[PDB]
């Protein structure tokens, strides 16, 4: 068998609050900061990144480069040849993390505002550290079906599962590139876990903190995993009448299996 060919796609890189990895002001001098910016729909190079086979991420022929290996320093654009090559190498993980192998630090957006300077931080699997290479500048709106065929629904600040109904906007969830799950009625709020301990009731809270408790991944086995805690989304005691969705260790019983519908 031939080894799979490794292509070099050209994509945008979407992250916190759906903003795009952006080379500030379209300037390409060495050291110019990379930022979050509203996603464009044109062919401007400063938001289109080439994922090359040498694990470098390039816009307009120059590399996405970390300034240093300490948590807190910013990420810039730079000549791929004249920069420290270890500072230009990046791994893109299936769980949404973009890591620099030399430093083990993670591309992050410590603020959710337009123009935020991108930095490298210690991995805590937060929303501020979630990314997705794509050309889709909008999140995917979906219904989440779970135990007994019921649908996840949001009311005020609470979340539970009720009978499915197409006209219920409170049952529509937008899956953002940063790993957060947000109610369609209020894209400023997130499916949030209070603590990293078991049987913590999940709520609907503001995405402001962009915390580890607000980042989720749909696993191949049907579970919705909170990466930092390692706990999964659980219909407590398999009883929807409790109106409690919680974090709980993975065990695979039907009260932990979900499915995103279109």
């Amino acid at each position, epitope marked *: 068998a031939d080894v799979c060919m490794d292509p070099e796609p050209i994509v945008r890189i979407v992250g916190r609050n759906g903003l795009c990895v952006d080379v500030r002001d379209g300037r390409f001098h060495n050291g110019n900061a990379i930022q979050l910016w509203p996603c464009k729909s044109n062919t401007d190079a400063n938001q289109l990144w080439t994922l090359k086979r040498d694990n470098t991420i390039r816009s307009n022929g120059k590399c996405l480069t970390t300034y240093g290996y300490s948590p807190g320093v910013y990420v810039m654009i730079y000549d791929c040849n004249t920069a420290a090559t270890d500072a230009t190498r990046w791994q893109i993980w299936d769980n949404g993390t973009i890591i620099n192998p030399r430093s083990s630090l993670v591309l992050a957006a410590t603020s959710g505002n337009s123009g935020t300077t991108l930095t490298v931080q210690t991995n805590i699997y937060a929303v501020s550290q979630g990314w997705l290479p794509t050309n889709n500048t909008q999140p995917f709106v979906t219904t989440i079906v779970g135990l007994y065929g019921l649908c996840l629904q949001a009311n005020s600040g609470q979340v539970w599962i009720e009978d499915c109904s197409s006209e219920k906007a409170e049952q529509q969830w937008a899956l953002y590139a940063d790993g957060s799950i947000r109610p369609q009625q209020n894209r400023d709020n997130c499916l949030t876990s209070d603590s990293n301990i078991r049987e913590t009731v999940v709520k609907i809270l503001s995405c402001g903190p962009a915390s580890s408790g607000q980042r989720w991944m749909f696993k191949n086995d049907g579970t919705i995993l909170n990466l930092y805690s390692g706990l999964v989304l659980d219909v407590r005691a*398999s009883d929807p*009448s*409790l109106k409690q969705i919680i974090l709980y260790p993975l*065990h695979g019983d039907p009260n932990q299996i979900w499915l995103p519908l279109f």
Partner: nanobody
Amino acid sequence: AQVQLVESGGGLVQPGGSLRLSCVASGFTFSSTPMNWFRQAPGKEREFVAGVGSRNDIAYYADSVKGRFTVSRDDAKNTVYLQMNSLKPEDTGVYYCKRPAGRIEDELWGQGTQVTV
């Protein structure tokens, strides 16, 4: 329809005592079916107590009762257990075993057993 729960084992005990409640199911594949315990004190609402998944690995407990009760399952005997240790006056009530469901009409209760003090 013939699916039915028979709770048993409630009694009158004094604080610090212990009791094991048992509910025996019939009419369905008992294995893999989640089973939960509820209790309704005089005047108050039915409140969730504990619940077991497919294995005894999987157990959910209300805060009121952690570290004292143990929900248990014996698939061979079609039986759910609620071991009740270090009993308190606050635990008095009728204890119901329930098979939860998506619609409330498919919820499945037994007749409950009385626990006092």
